[PDB]
Swiss-Prot record, chain A:
GO terms for molecular function: MDM2/MDM4 family protein binding; rRNA binding; structural constituent of ribosome; ubiquitin ligase inhibitor activity; zinc ion binding. This is Large ribosomal subunit protein eL37. The gene is RPL37. Its main location: cytoplasm. The modification N6-acetyllysine is found at K9. It comes from Oryctolagus cuniculus (Rabbit). One of its GO terms (biological process) is translation. Zn(2+) binds at C18, C21, C33, C36. It is found in: Cytoplasm. The keyword Zinc-finger applies. Component of the large ribosomal subunit. The ribosome is a large ribonucleoprotein complex responsible for the synthesis of proteins in the cell. It comes from the Eukaryota. Keywords: Acetylation, Cytoplasm, Metal-binding, Phosphoprotein, Ribonucleoprotein, Ribosomal protein, RNA-binding, rRNA-binding, Zinc, Zinc-finger. InterPro entries: Ribosomal_eL37, Ribosomal_eL37/eL43, Ribosomal_eL37_CS, Ribosomal_zn-bd. GO terms for cellular component: cytosolic large ribosomal subunit; synapse.
Curated annotation (Swiss-Prot), chain B:
Pfam families: Ribosomal_L2, Ribosomal_L2_C. The lineage of its organism: Eukaryota, Metazoa, Chordata, Craniata, Vertebrata. It is found in: Cytoplasm. One of its GO terms (molecular function) is rRNA binding. This is Large ribosomal subunit protein uL2. Keywords: Cytoplasm, Hydroxylation, Isopeptide bond, Ribonucleoprotein, Ribosomal protein, RNA-binding, rRNA-binding, Ubl conjugation. It comes from Oryctolagus cuniculus (Rabbit).
Length: 86, 239
RNA sequence: CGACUCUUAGCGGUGGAUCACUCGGCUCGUGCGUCGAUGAAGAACGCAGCUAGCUGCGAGAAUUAAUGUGAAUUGCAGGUUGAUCAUCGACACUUCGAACGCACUUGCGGCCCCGGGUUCCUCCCGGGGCUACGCCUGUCUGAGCGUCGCU
RNA sequence: UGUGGCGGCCAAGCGUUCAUAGCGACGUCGCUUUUUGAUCCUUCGAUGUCGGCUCUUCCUAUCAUUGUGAAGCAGAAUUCACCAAGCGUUGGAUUGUUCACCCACUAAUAGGGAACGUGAGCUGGGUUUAGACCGUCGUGAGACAGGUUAGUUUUACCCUACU
RNA sequence: GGUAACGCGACCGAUCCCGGAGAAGCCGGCGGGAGCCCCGGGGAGAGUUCUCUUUUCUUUGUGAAGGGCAGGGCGCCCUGGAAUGGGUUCGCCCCGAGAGAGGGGCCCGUGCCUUGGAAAGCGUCGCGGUUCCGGCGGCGUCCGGUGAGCUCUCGCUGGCCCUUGAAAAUCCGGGGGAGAGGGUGUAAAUCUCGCGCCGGGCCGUACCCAUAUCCGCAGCAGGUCUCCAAGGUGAACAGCCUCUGGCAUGUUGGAACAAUGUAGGUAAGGGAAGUCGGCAAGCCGGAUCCGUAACUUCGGGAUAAGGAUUGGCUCUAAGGGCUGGCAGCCGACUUAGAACUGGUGCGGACCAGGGGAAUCCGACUGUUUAAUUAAAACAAAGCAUCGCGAAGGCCCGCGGCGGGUGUUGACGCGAUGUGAUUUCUGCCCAGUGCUCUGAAUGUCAAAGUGAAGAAAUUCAAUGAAGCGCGGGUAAACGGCGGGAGUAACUAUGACUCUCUUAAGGUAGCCAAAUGCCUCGUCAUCUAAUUAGUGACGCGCAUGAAUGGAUGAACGAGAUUCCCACUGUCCCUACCUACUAUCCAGCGAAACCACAGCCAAGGGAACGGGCUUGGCGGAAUCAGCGGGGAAAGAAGACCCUGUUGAGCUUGACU
RNA sequence: GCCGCCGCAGGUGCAGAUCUUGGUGGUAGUAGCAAAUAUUCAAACGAGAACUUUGAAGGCCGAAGUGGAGAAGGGUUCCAUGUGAACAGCAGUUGAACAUGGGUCAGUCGGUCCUGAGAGAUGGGCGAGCGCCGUUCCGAAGGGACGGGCGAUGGCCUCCGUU
RNA sequence: GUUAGGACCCGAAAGAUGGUGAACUAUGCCUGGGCAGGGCGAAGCCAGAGGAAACUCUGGUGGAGGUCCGUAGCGGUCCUGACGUGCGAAUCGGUCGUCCGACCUGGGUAUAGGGGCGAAAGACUAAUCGAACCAUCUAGUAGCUGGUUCCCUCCAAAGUUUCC
RNA sequence: AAAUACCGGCACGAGACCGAUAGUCAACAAGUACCGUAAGGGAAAGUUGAAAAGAACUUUGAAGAGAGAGUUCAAGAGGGCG
RNA sequence: CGCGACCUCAGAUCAGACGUGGCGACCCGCUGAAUUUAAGCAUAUUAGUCAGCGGAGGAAAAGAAACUAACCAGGAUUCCCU
C-alpha cells in the first residue's frame, strides 16, 4: 500500500521554474529558490559542486558585451572616432 | 518537547481582562461605570463581562474587561475609586478596607493591572494591615503570606464558576473535546512504555522501575524527570 | 537414397574485427592580461520567401551607415556608377534579471508635458519624461525651561 | 564400540529328588549401528533442518500361519529350537509431541533401514526474527533445559528414469 | 395622514460619537410553498386486432425586470380586564409586568394572471424552390381534484456543550446645529422621484475527468476531490426485473470434451468418532402471536432459552371534508373476521441471528508496527503525592530585558506512578538516592594578610560550595530467615526454647500468561483422558498502588462440554463453466565446463566420467515429480579479525 | 603505403579474474494470447472484411450505471482532407498513427479588492562574516484635510480644478 | 633487494564538511462538505384509582445515549484460497470491526536529520529509516579473499631455535 | 616600482602524447537528448563514388518487392553505399 | 509671549559624485572536522588540511630598523643554491 496506491495521491507539485536562473528549483511553500536563491542578492555556489560550475558557465551564454570588450581591447580603446572617408 | 506542538490553541479567545489604568481619579476620587453584558469567554473557565466607562478628558465610549464575580447581574452601576462605598463588585485600595476582606484579582506590585488570584473560584485573604510604611500581609490560596506595599487595588467578591472540579470526568468523549480545546498533551504515555533512546526511564524486558524516583534539584535537561526534590511521599497524614 | 548427429573445400546473411585516412582531443611556452546602474553576468521569447536544431541579431530584429577590394548565392523565384565577403571607430541593442514605485496574482499607485475630446470644462483614450536603499561637501526647512545677549 | 542389545565356555547352585526340561552365581570370548559418547576427513560463493498424513521395495535378530524335532506335553494350553520374510501384524481419549499410558478386539496386534527415507509432495501445533504477561537474578543495557500467546513456505516448459 | 404599528414622490445639513448587516455550532420534531411523480375525461402520432380489448405508450406552457391578489410569520399599537381558571402544540410554553372577544397594520411572497408573450418553440397535414429560404398555409399548445409518494426552499419550537462555535474591506441607519438662502415671487439653496447622454481596462474560455487522455517504466482489476438520480416489488438511497443513455466481452478465433488444476452446486446411511484445532464448509434465518431462568452495579440479560401461522377467488365490519341532535354531495389508506378452493402448497428466486453453561485476562467505543502478530499492547474513567507567588517551575537557544508556557495565577502551569463499580495498600531507614539545619566542625581551590631571605623561593592563621555530622523520607528503589523438644494407641501438629538482622511474608489468591520434582492427592465428566472444573499450600522462584480480591454487559482475545446440521471422515462417485490438447497469426524467460543406460571398489572417508563386471538398435507428443548434492544469497546459525555501529554504567579522558 | 639492418624508448606478448563493452546460440516455435455472460445474418466503398459501415433480431449495465458534466492533472489530445514507414502482443480500409489546414469572441462569467492560519521589509539590538531576534520591539511615525487672510494667473480673475 | 608517497588492481561494516526534501506517511490551525431504512422509550407532562396525611399504582404523550442490525464511507481477523517470472516492486473472492460521534476528509500554512513527528510500534519520514538523499575528503582502512599475459637452458627450497 | 605565482580568458607556435569502446564525457544541431518532486546524475554516434554520372527504357504486381538495360576503371562502390 | 546665534539631532524625485552583483587560475585577512599514521588508542601526526566568508589588482603580499651579531664586522625588501 506504500507503492502504487501511494503514487495516485501525488498530484500537487511544489517545485517549479524560477525566473532568475531559469531552473526547476522554486518551492512554493518556502518561497526560496533552491538553485541560486531568490530572496538573497547573491547566487548560491560551492566548490564541492564541480559539475555545477561547468553546467552554467560564462561561455554558454551571449557574451555580447564581453566580445566587444575584447574587440575594443585589441584595438586600444579609441573613443568615438570616425574612419577616413574618400 | 520545546514548542509549536504542546502549546495552547488560542484562536477564538481574543484579548485579556485587564484592570483599569491608574490616575488621580483612582488615587483620590471615584467614578461610575455601567455593566453592559456578561459572556462565557472561550478558553477561560470563568466568564467575562463588559464594563463601560468614559474618559474624563476625551469622548469615546470606553470599555473594560473584568472577571465576573459570583452573584452579579447586568445593567448595574459599578463605582470605582478610593472614596467609594463598600459593596459587591468594587475595586478599591487595600489601605482603606479593613482586615478580613475576601478579595480577588489582586496585584503583587502596583502597576501590573491584576495578576494574583483571579481564576475560577479563587480568592486571597488579607490577614492584617500595617499603618506605618504601608505594608499588608495577604494569605494566598496556597497558604503562604505575602507582603504587599498596599498601593494596589482589588475588587470585592469571589470569582463566579466555583466548584467546577468537584464532579469527576464523565467520559473520554467529553475529555477528548475538552483537551482538544485546551492543549494537545492529553495522550499521556508512560515512560516505561516509551523508548529508552529518548526517555530515561524506558528500557528493559519486564515492566519495572529499578531506580529511585527522587532526583536532585541540580540536574540538567533530559534527566530531570519525576518527583522534583520530594521531601516526603505517599499518603498525607494529618496536615 | 530421403531426413537427422559430426568433420572438411566453395558461397550468401547479422556483426563492423584488421589496416589506412582525421577541419579532433592532451601537454608546454611566449607577450598582453579588461565587467557593470552611461543597466554587468544569466534565463525566457521573437526575427529568414519556402526556415525543426545550431549559429547570427533585437520590432532598425540570420543583422544597418562607412572602408580595402571588385561581378556574388544556389534547389528555385531577382539585379560594375559598387553584389559577395573581411574590417567596423557611428547608432539601434526587446521582457525578466545586481533590476531600482509595491507585490511578483501582471494586478495596482502618484507627479509633469503634448495629440483626439475640446473650445481648460472636465471625465475617457494614446505618447514621452519621472518615481528603491545608506552616504558625502554647497542650498532648503523647522525641534531642543542647554547657554546667553536685548525688551 | 565408552552405552544399548545378542550368541557361546566352565557350571557355586535353584529347579521336591536330579548340574544341562527352564535356568543361573564367579569370571569370560565376538558382534553390530534404529540410541546415547569421543573424534574432526570434507560442506560456511548454503544439500531448505522437529514431528504428523500418503507411498514402495529390502533385511531377519520370528509374533501368528505351512512343514518337523524337544518337556517336569492324561487332553486344551505353556514355551526350547529348525527349515523359513510367501502372505498378514487395528480403532479411539490425552500430549505439538518422538517416546510413554489406557480401553475394546483379533491370528499377530514382532522388531528396522532407505544421506536422522520422505516440502519445485502437504501441515505449521511447538522450537527457530522482533511484540507483551508473570516469577527469579543482574543497580544497569539484559539472562533464564521456566512457561504463556499470534506470527508471509517462490518456480519444472530443460535432461534422464517411470507410465 | 392616523392614538399607533407605518405609508406616500423628491422632502437639507459638517467634525465627532453610537448601533446594524457583514458574521457564524450540531441534532430532533412539526407546518406551509414549489419541482419530479399518480389519476379521470378531451386532442395529434404509431403497435396489437386467428380471439377479445371505450386497449398500449410519446405529449400537452412560460424567464429576467415593475405592480396587484392569494398564503404564511407577527416578541406590532389600540376598545376592554380574566380563578369556578382561560386561548393553545405532533410536543410545550405563555397569562392583572395584561388571556381569550373586536378593528387596523407593516415583512417575505418563487403560487395566480397581466406588459414582456405567441411573433418564438413543439408536432400533424399539404404547397413549392430538383436547391439557396428564422419559407408558406389550417388545428392543438387542454379541462380538475388530490396524495404521511421522492427532492429543494422557508417558517415555528425544543434539546446538546466542564467544547460556546472566526477575522478584514464595504455601506447606509441615529442624536448633532457652525455654516451656506431670501423678501413675497419667474423667490434662492436643496434634490436619494420619473427621466435623457456617454463608457466600464487586463488575464483564461477548445477536449477527458476514466478497466485508452490523472499517477503508478505501460489500452495497468490499484489509488482516485464533487453535482444531477425513472416504474413495480418492498419499511428501505437494501436486492431483482423493465424506461432514457451507453455497450459490442475488455493482449485472439474454430474444433472436439482426456487426466489433472480454478469457481460452483447435487449427493443413499451415520453425523467432528479424522486432524493441535466444528479450521474451512453446512444448518437456523424475516413478520405476526404466546412466552421467558441463573446472576446483577437492577439499567442489561433478551431476539434469552422456547413453540403455532405464512397462497388464489369472492364478501362483511371499523376509522373523514363541504353545504343547509338533523339529510345530501365528495371519499384515501390501514386493521379484524368467515366459507369455498390449490397434489401440505405457501418469508415458493432476492434479502436472510447459531445458541446454552464454565475458566483466565482486559471494562468497553477508539489508536496501532504502509507490506507476516490485532491482540491480555496503548489511549483509559478513578486515586496518590513533588516543585513554584513572575527577583521564579520547566523546555529551547550561538547570541540581543530572546521565545514558548503566558491572551497564564494554586479549581494554574510541568512532571510522574498506577488506572470502569466496591474493601485494603501492612511492617522496615539495614543500604542507595531526596529534603532540612548550622561555626559546637576533621576536611577544604583561587585570591588576600603576616614572617625569613640581595631576589626568584619557603612557612603560618584564615580556608567558599561540597563531603562527614543530627532528623524525616518505603503512592522512591526494594526487603519482610533457619534449627529442636512437644499434648492419653499411633499419625500429625497447638505450645515452648535458641541463633540472628531492619522489623524476618500481614491478609488474600494459587501446580495460575506464576510449581523443576509433578502426568503432585481427591470428586467429576468419558470404554480410556499428560485435558477442564471444584480442593490444601507445603510455593526451586507467589504476594499486598513495581499491586491484590471481586467483577453486571462486551471483546475479529486464549481454552472445556452439549444441542443444530454438513461428504471433515467412513468412501468415494457425478454435472456445468473457466481450464488444459490440436489448427491460422504472433511469440518470451530461467539455466548452460560438457553431456545425462547401471552395480561394486577406492577417494578430499556417498561419482555420470577412474577399473572390473552387466548393456547400449532412428525421432518426437500428453502426464508425473525420483535425481541433476535443480536456480537463488561470498550462510540469516558459530568463531576470528589487534573490523565498524546503537543502548547503558560509579570503566578511561 | 610498407620491410630489413645499427643503437634507443614503451600505454610492447592474455584464457580465465560471479573481469568491461558489444555481438550471437541450445533453450524454442516451448510456456503463453482465461479477473468482470452474448452475439447472429443481408448488402457495401475496397484487390482483400471473425473484428469497420448501415438495416434487422436477441441481450447487458438497472438512476449508488458500462449515463451526462466539472476541479487537480494532461496541453491539441477537438474537427476536416490525404496517407499506408512503425504501434493498437494475429488483424485493420479504422484509431488519441503520420503530414497539411481550421478551431476557444464577456461592461453583466471567475481572478483582480480584503483578511484568517502563517510568512515577512523596517526602528532598535546582536553577530569577524554571508547574516540573526522581533512584528511596536528603546523611535523626530498623520506629506492628509473643513474653514480665514494675503500676490498671482485660464475663461470680462465672476465661479470652480486652480496655485 | 627494501621503505614513504594512489604505490599489481578492485572491494566494504563507518566519520566529517555543505546543500535539498512534511506532494506518500505523522501532529496541529484556518476555511468547507458528507454520513439511508428500522428497534429499545431515558427525561418534561395529562387523566383515573387507592389512602386521613405522607404518598403509591394504572392507561396514553414524548424522543435519549461515548445506542444497536445495517447503506454510503473508513481498514482488512480467518480460509495461510486465486496469483505468486501477477492486472499489481503488496491485487482479488468468501469473509468482517464500525456507521450522530473519540467518524473519514478536499485546499492554504507550521514543525527536517543525533533533529522533527509519534493514542508509544527504533514505529514513519517520497518503491530507502536501529539515524533520509546527493557531492567532496576518498584511490579513507583492510595481518583478507578473487585474478594478474612470449619461448629455451642451468641451479635448486622450508612448514622449524627465540621473541612480542 | 625591481627579480616572485597563473590550472580561467584574450592571439599563436611546437610536440620520441592518443587515434573513433582510444584521446576532454562529448572529432557530428553535447552537459545535447534523457532520468529524478530536488540538491543532482549523465549517454549512443566517422569513413558511397575523383566526379551523383542517385539508375531514364520494358514487364510482373494495388503498391510494396523482383527480372532485363544505362553510368563508371571497376556496383567486385546500389541512397545506413572504405 | 515677542527679536537675532553656538552645540546635539532631523527628510529628500534638492545640483553632482559612490557601494550593491555574475565570475575569479594567482593572492590578502579569519574560522578550519575526521577518515587515517602511531599494525589497538586518547598525547602526538595527518593539520593553519578540504570546505566556508569578505576583497581588489595584472599582480597581491612586500619594504628603509627599538636589525644579524661578539666578528679586524656589516646596514631597505625579494627569489634560488649550499
Ligand atoms: Mg484418533
Amino acid at each position: 500500500t506504500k507503492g502504487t496506491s501511494s503514487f495516485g495521491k501525488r498530484r500537487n507539485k511544489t517545485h517549479t521554474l524560477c525566473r532568475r536562473c531559469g531552473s526547476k528549483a522554486y518551492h512554493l511553500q518556502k518561497s526560496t529558490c533552491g538553485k541560486c536563491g531568490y530572496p538573497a542578492k547573491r547566487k548560491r555556489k560551492y566548490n564541492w559542486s564541480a559539475k555545477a560550475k561547468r553546467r552554467n558557465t560564462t561561455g554558454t551564454g551571449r557574451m555580447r558585451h564581453l566580445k566587444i570588450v575584447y574587440r575594443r581591447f585589441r584595438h586600444g580603446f579609441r573613443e568615438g572616432t570616425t574612419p577616413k572617408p574618400k | 518537547g520545546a514548542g509549536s506542538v504542546f502549546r495552547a490553541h488560542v484562536k477564538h479567545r481574543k484579548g485579556a481582562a485587564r484592570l483599569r489604568a491608574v490616575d488621580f481619579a483612582e488615587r483620590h476620587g471615584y467614578i461610575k461605570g455601567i455593566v453592559k453584558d456578561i459572556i462565557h469567554d472561550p478558553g477561560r473557565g470563568a466568564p467575562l463581562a463588559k464594563v463601560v466607562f468614559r474618559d474624563p478628558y476625551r469622548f469615546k465610549k470606553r470599555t473594560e474587561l473584568f472577571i465576573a464575580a459570583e452573584g452579579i447581574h447586568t445593567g448595574q452601576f459599578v463605582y470605582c475609586g478610593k472614596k467609594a462605598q463598600l459593596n459587591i463588585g468594587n475595586v478599591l485600595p487595600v489601605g482603606t478596607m479593613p482586615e478580613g476582606t475576601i478579595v480577588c484579582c489582586l496585584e503583587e506590585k502596583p502597576g501590573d493591572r491584576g495578576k494574583l488570584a483571579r481564576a475560577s473560584g479563587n480568592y486571597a485573604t488579607v490577614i492584617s494591615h500595617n499603618p506605618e510604611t504601608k505594608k499588608t500581609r495577604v494569605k494566598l490560596p496556597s497558604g503562604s503570606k505575602k507582603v504587599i506595599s498596599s498601593a494596589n487595588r482589588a475588587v470585592v467578591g469571589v470569582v463566579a464558576g466555583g466548584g467546577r472540579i468537584d464532579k469527576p470526568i464523565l467520559k473520554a468523549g467529553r475529555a477528548y473535546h475538552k483537551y482538544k480545546a485546551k492543549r494537545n498533551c492529553w495522550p499521556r504515555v508512560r515512560g516505561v512504555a516509551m523508548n529508552p533512546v529518548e526517555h530515561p526511564f524506558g528500557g528493559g524486558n519486564h515492566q519495572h522501575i529499578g531506580k529511585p524516583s527522587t532526583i536532585r534539584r541540580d540536574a540538567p535537561a533530559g534527566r530531570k524527570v519525576g518527583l522534583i526534590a520530594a521531601r516526603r511521599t505517599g499518603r498525607l497524614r494529618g496536615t
